From Swiss-Prot, chain A:
<protein>
    <recommendedName>
        <fullName>26S proteasome regulatory subunit 6A</fullName>
    </recommendedName>
</protein>
<comment type="function">
    <text>The 26S proteasome is involved in the ATP-dependent degradation of ubiquitinated proteins. The regulatory (or ATPase) complex confers ATP dependency and substrate specificity to the 26S complex.</text>
</comment>
<comment type="similarity">
    <text>Belongs to the AAA ATPase family.</text>
</comment>
From Swiss-Prot, chain B:
<feature type="modified residue" description="Phosphoserine">
    <location>
        <position position="134"/>
    </location>
</feature>
<protein>
    <recommendedName>
        <fullName>26S proteasome regulatory subunit 7 homolog</fullName>
    </recommendedName>
</protein>
<comment type="function">
    <text>The 26S proteasome is involved in the ATP-dependent degradation of ubiquitinated proteins. The regulatory (or ATPase) complex confers ATP dependency and substrate specificity to the 26S complex.</text>
</comment>
<comment type="similarity">
    <text>Belongs to the AAA ATPase family.</text>
</comment>
<feature type="modified residue" description="Phosphoserine">
    <location>
        <position position="67"/>
    </location>
</feature>
<comment type="subunit">
    <text>Interacts with UBR1 and CIC1.</text>
</comment>
């Protein structure tokens, strides 16, 4: 019952820690994700 | 010695010609066979980088927006292989590739046989000259 007080504040503070980390690690990835790269072909599953 | 002193103003203007090259200085240094650039550093989707050659064949499904701001890098982007249209940023597209074309100027030929060509030449005039006079008809 009383756990939800500090649990809701902790889970909401992790939005930038978990979800936004996908786009936070893209700082150096997006520059590589930009079209000026070398393409490839997948020859094996 | 005209060419000797012509380069005096040309070499000084070569830097002015290089000023247009100063836009993209990467990759060292309009008819084209196939569209080719170096890495296309300039460039839904924002940037557009496509090249067809023995190395790094590229393809993009989207387009028709301004990434590059007109010419970029190798300056050759546009129609080749068909299938490929970069239009929106002032294209150098649909341009003659390496080929053999015979183009001359003023093929001057006077009248030869008017005997049976009286109304026969008029049929030739109705081909080319006719739409160039009164197209409203």
């Amino acid at each position: 019952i009383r756990i939800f007080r500090s649990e809701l504040q902790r889970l909401s503070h992790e939005n930038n820690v978990m979800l936004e980390k996908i786009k936070d690690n893209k700082e150096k990835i997006k520059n590589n994700r930009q079209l000026p790269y070398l393409v490839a072909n997948v020859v094996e599953v | 010695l005209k060419q000797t002193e012509n380069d005096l103003k040309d070499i000084e203007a070569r830097i002015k010609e290089k000023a247009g090259v100063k836009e993209s200085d990467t990759g060292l240094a309009h008819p084209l066979q196939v569209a080719r650039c170096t890495k296309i550093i300039k460039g839904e989707d924002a940037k557009y980088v496509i090249n067809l050659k023995q190395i790094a064949k590229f393809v993009v499904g989207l387009g028709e927006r301004v990434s590059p701001t007109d010419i970029e890098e190798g300056m050759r982007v546009g129609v080749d292989r068909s299938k490929y249209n970069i239009e929106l940023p002032l294209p150098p597209r649909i341009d003659p590739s390496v080929t053999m074309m015979t183009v001359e100027e003023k093929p001057d030929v006077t009248y030869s046989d008017v005997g049976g060509c009286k109304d026969q030449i008029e049929k030739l005039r109705e081909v080319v000259e006719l739409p160039l006079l009164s197209p409203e008809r």
